[PDB]
Enzyme design. Structure first.
Site, short mmCIF file in Angstrom:
data_model
loop_
_atom_site.label_atom_id
_atom_site.label_comp_id
_atom_site.label_asym_id
_atom_site.label_seq_id
_atom_site.Cartn_x
_atom_site.Cartn_y
_atom_site.Cartn_z
N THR D 13 0.81 -1.26 0.16
CA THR D 13 -0.01 0.10 -0.03
C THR D 13 0.77 1.26 -0.09
O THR D 13 0.15 2.31 -0.40
CB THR D 13 -0.94 0.26 1.11
OG1 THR D 13 -1.62 -1.40 1.44
CG2 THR D 13 -1.90 1.10 1.14
N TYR D 27 -8.57 -0.35 -2.30
CA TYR D 27 -7.71 0.31 -3.37
C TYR D 27 -6.53 -0.49 -3.83
O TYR D 27 -6.65 -1.75 -3.64
CB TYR D 27 -6.54 1.15 -2.27
CG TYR D 27 -5.97 0.41 -1.05
CD1 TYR D 27 -5.00 -0.19 -1.05
CD2 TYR D 27 -6.95 0.51 0.28
CE1 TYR D 27 -4.37 -0.93 0.13
CE2 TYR D 27 -6.31 -0.07 1.30
CZ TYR D 27 -5.22 -0.91 1.21
OH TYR D 27 -4.64 -1.63 2.21
N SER D 59 1.68 -8.62 -0.40
CA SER D 59 2.17 -9.25 0.39
C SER D 59 1.50 -10.56 1.05
O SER D 59 2.20 -11.59 1.86
CB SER D 59 3.04 -8.31 1.62
OG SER D 59 2.04 -8.12 2.61
N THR D 92 1.93 -4.29 4.10
CA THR D 92 1.99 -4.70 5.61
C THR D 92 1.67 -6.11 6.00
O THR D 92 1.66 -6.52 7.31
CB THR D 92 1.13 -3.51 6.23
OG1 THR D 92 -0.06 -3.76 5.89
CG2 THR D 92 1.85 -2.10 6.23
N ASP D 93 0.65 -6.74 5.41
CA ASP D 93 0.34 -8.17 5.96
C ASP D 93 1.18 -8.91 6.35
O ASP D 93 0.97 -9.63 7.38
CB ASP D 93 -0.43 -8.84 4.74
CG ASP D 93 -1.87 -8.28 4.71
OD1 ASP D 93 -2.37 -7.02 4.72
OD2 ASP D 93 -2.73 -8.96 4.38
N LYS D 165 1.82 -7.08 13.41
CA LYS D 165 0.58 -6.01 12.97
C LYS D 165 -0.37 -6.46 13.80
O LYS D 165 -0.90 -7.88 13.61
CB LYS D 165 0.26 -6.38 11.25
CG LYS D 165 -0.80 -5.34 11.20
CD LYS D 165 -1.12 -5.62 9.54
CE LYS D 165 -2.13 -5.04 8.80
NZ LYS D 165 -1.98 -4.80 7.29
N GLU D 286 1.99 -26.97 29.84
CA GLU D 286 0.90 -27.68 29.47
C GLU D 286 1.02 -28.97 29.00
O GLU D 286 0.26 -29.73 29.06
CB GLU D 286 0.16 -26.91 28.58
CG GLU D 286 -0.43 -25.52 29.09
CD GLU D 286 -1.65 -25.61 30.14
OE1 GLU D 286 -2.18 -26.72 30.03
OE2 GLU D 286 -1.89 -24.61 30.68
#
Lengths: 330, 329, 330, 329
Positions: D13, D27, D59, D92-93, D165, D286
């Site tokens: 982007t 976009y 991405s 950004t992903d 993110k 665990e």
């Protein structure tokens, strides 16, 4: 074999107590005793060889510059002993953040110094003090805690004494830093994620050993309609530096500037700090002409940490440019 | 049709840096409400926009008179049939004090949105254009009615009650301890929570009946503090003192005596704190409030507690009522 | 006089005992399980008339959809009784957010339902379960908690059962909501600051009374180089709806949209969620043409929470447009 | 003596553009490098800047082959006398995944900054301009060398290792549980913290010796989950499976059997979690990892744990070495 950790008790909630358990309020401040306290966390004995001492019995909100010099000295003498590996200090949470930053600046030692407090009275239901104390001894006794500055160990976290602040009332995760924690303590074991980037302890230009007196420094608050009254009154009363807790980026009301330039001329340092304390910092020459007026900006330091830095810096210089440098490295 | 939204300009949103790379250092409050509406032509896609320069101030220098003047003008507009929502552009330093003042005294259900910007208009990635567009998107939406005064910054819908300037320099400067009420994305509002405290139409306070505000001052608490600022502020006519205490509004024992005395002489004593990211000050916990006849500011930070008290004192001086007020607004 | 609260234990004991609280004949004679739980924290008795019942004995990470149904059905029976003013459910923290959500959507009642757990074992130093359970009871018995939806009371907070999520490992403050706490609970007293804006309990269109079985819904994680393998295996093993935990704003890898479109066609509902869970939400038609492909966006709902809303919505509809509507109102 | 910075464009982007200024959705990202650098002309007062387009991807669709290519190009420039710093523009992903990869295998102390945008460059108050400016300001500074891969968004300098993110839509999307290392304001850097984990010049991994990466996949855990995704991923060739468990990387008891057996058959089992705002997963807490011969991902979220395993797997298949690496990087 085990490390030799000394606990310096100074009072606290930790060794406080309310009427009972459901009562995590109204409790009496600095209620028990060091040997009494150590004796109640027998697990300590598995981590290190622990000795305790009561240095003072105070409420952190009523602390004094002298109580600070007294504690400062005491830790210095302990840090020098060949048979003290780390030091835990028990303290009231109200002003824990001030002492912690005070010790980070003037304790020229590598040995881990740990300050711990508790948010709930010890007799309170689910009281946090036991575990915080267990973890403070755990950190003071680990060789990896050496050289990271003053540490605060509350809520499973390892916070830096420089920037952790009491930011959340009532809750157990009251202590937060805008730059985050350095690590976590889980089951007495230490986990590091970050290191300090600012000058402290062993790399500090200040030495408690060389401090006999601390200068008088005070704080004035800025808000809508503020006037110069509180500032001139604290100066008139002895303030050698005034910490301006401004709105925004250390901004000064137009109704106060004149007061502040005159005070400056009459030799009072003016340090612009702010009441915008979750992150960011105060920028020099952004809201006021610090170069022209000869004022100093506190960088990311809240009003009370900025007070601590100044009283100490002023033990060695009265030069605005020197103080600016200092606010920029500590 | 389209909502009729009025922008009241009070003077960073209006600031200009010396450069594009001057995302600070700027002169704030140097541009006209008219050139502001015109810089953002897309506004016209949301509502019928008209603006007014109510004043041009630097918010760190606002006075009580500027508050009363903005509060009365807003009331006059809200009364008009030709006004559906109102937007106030304001400097960020005290945006939090003005936003709460309005929430307490504007007995209207029309949306009042207060907006500012962290970067000056001439800066690279200036946040202002979107903030304004969103303030107008919220003010224009029927859904905004009745939720109290709103602050629309950084894509969020915040309550003017408890939003505060908490982070310096960042575009996300404004936060609340109880979170945002929603978000505003692409001019659309998304709601997740509703206010629980008294405000606007449910307020017992009315701008229309306020002719002056009482003087209220704030004193800070820290290691080695003295009664000096406390005594001076009072001597200078403070009618109530906000104590910005350490921890749960705690009081230095060398200060208590001066507080008792001031109280005895009629100054209201409100215990607040500089522990503002969350939590609240609890009555009778660190100090015997019942016995000294003091009030606790609850979760309100010091500049907010001062706003509630100036206004509460316009109607009562009973510390029992001031305390109920601190617990409901 | 005193409200009547029922505690439903779903696993092991979330809190320890205390002073006489444990030595007492009461405690001592108390039958293990939920009876020793109540007996250990005698202060409970001063909040309400409490009664326990062990409805199941599960480890929350191993819950199944039949366990949900059973708890769901037992809560409805209890809520219906005139003799029940409020219910506390003690639960494992791993899937507490999932149950809390399910109960908020299907329990048509205004009586307080409070889910509570513990981050530290009832036996640890500074164990939080005791105070958590004391506050759950305090909340379940206040007329002010009525009509607020399912509540979770941990770390002195009142969290909405809808969007509260286990977000921090280890710490007692593990549960956070992106939209904040509704309030706080201190010394047994409730302090409210926000109200829910989404559909729940009394205004819900779903009713456990009427749900007999839940549809199979599964979750697929997206990251760099993901393929359609798990999407396709889950559908083939019976999933009626796929929750896509996507990167960013529920984005889909171009290598995967093909499988998605074909599963869609063969009737599987495609719900676009994300693994970006501290705030914001997934926007319809932004990363993918939801309209064209007939997909649904999970709005602000994390993966496991979106799975819950869908298993339920699909008890009543299979219309993509209705599902969309429900993702936007609950 | 201006520093020499090379800008590598890969898409996303920052380089995005919608059909309007109002739209921060729908976009086409990876639409436009010269365009990039010409648009922020002030870059020229920072450093001598040159750019190259390495790939033009979205991405969320990145492949491991895309990571080796990039990683290889960065090493080639990092070696050149002519490059002082590298800035990479990315969607950004999966920016948190390439920043971490690069942090692990780029044996260089020269500053590597990965930057993106939350808003398309067409949008009002678009964040890319300043972000980009800031990336070049940080990559140009002597002080940035030796700190690991850095991400500069929202005025912060975040560590490429743990930044993630975490918030959708907002310009503050990128956060770390351990905080920012500092901030960059007006092209200047302020440092508050340093990295404590191995990275770059101190990593035992080197992109020059990596010619391939093992397949690693992720399975999600929740109420009523089954062994289905675990098994289908392993059948399809995953060599390691990252378990994104509930809580402290907890395993449904209905799934333990498929895991023990996959372990037997040679797949590595890395326990991570979907409790990503803080804390970490404890060994043997665990699950009996010692007995099962499994590994714990420490504080690393699912997507980061995958990058680290695929990389550690180029050197060792030893569970105990793997555990060690999970504890040092």
């Amino acid at each position: 074999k085990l490390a030799n950790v000394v606990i310096l008790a100074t009072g606290g909630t930790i060794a406080g107590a309310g009427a009972s358990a459901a009562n995590s309020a109204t409790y009496q401040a600095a209620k028990v005793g060091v040997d009494k306290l150590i004796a109640g966390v027998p697990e300590l004995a598995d981590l290190a060889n622990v000795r305790g001492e009561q240095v003072m019995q105070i409420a952190s909100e009523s602390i004094t510059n002298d109580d600070l010099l007294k504690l400062g000295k005491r830790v210095a003498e302990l840090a020098d002993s060949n048979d003290v590996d780390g030091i835990v200090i028990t303290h009231g949470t109200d002003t824990l953040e001030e002492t912690a930053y005070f010790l980070d600046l003037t304790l020229n030692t590598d040995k881990p110094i740990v300050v711990v407090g508790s948010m709930r009275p010890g007799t309170a239901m689910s009281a946090d003090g036991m575990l915080n104390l267990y973890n403070a001894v755990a950190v003071a006794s680990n060789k990896d805690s050496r050289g990271k500055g003053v540490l605060v160990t509350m809520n499973d976290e390892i916070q830096s004494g420089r920037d952790v602040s009491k930011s959340i009332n009532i809750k157990t995760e009251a202590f937060k830093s805008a730059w985050g924690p350095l690590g976590m303590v889980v089951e007495g074991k230490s986990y590091w994620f970050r290191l300090p980037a600012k000058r402290h302890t062993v790399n500090s230009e200040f030495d408690i050993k060389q401090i006999s007196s601390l200068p008088q420094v005070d704080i004035a608050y800025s808000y809508g309609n503020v006037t110069d009254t509180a500032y001139k009154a604290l100066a008139q009363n002895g303030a050698k530096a005034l910490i301006h807790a401004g709105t925004g980026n250390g901004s000064v009301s137009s109704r106060l500037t004149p007061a502040l330039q005159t005070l400056r001329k009459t030799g009072t340092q003016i340090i612009r700090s702010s009441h915008v304390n979750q992150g960011g910092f105060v920028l020099r020459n952004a809201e006021q002409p610090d170069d022209k007026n000869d004022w100093v900006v506190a960088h990311d330091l809240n009003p009370e940490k900025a007070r601590i830095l100044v009283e100490l810096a002023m033990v060695k210089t009265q030069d605005s440019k020197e103080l600016q440098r200092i606010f920029w490295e500590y």
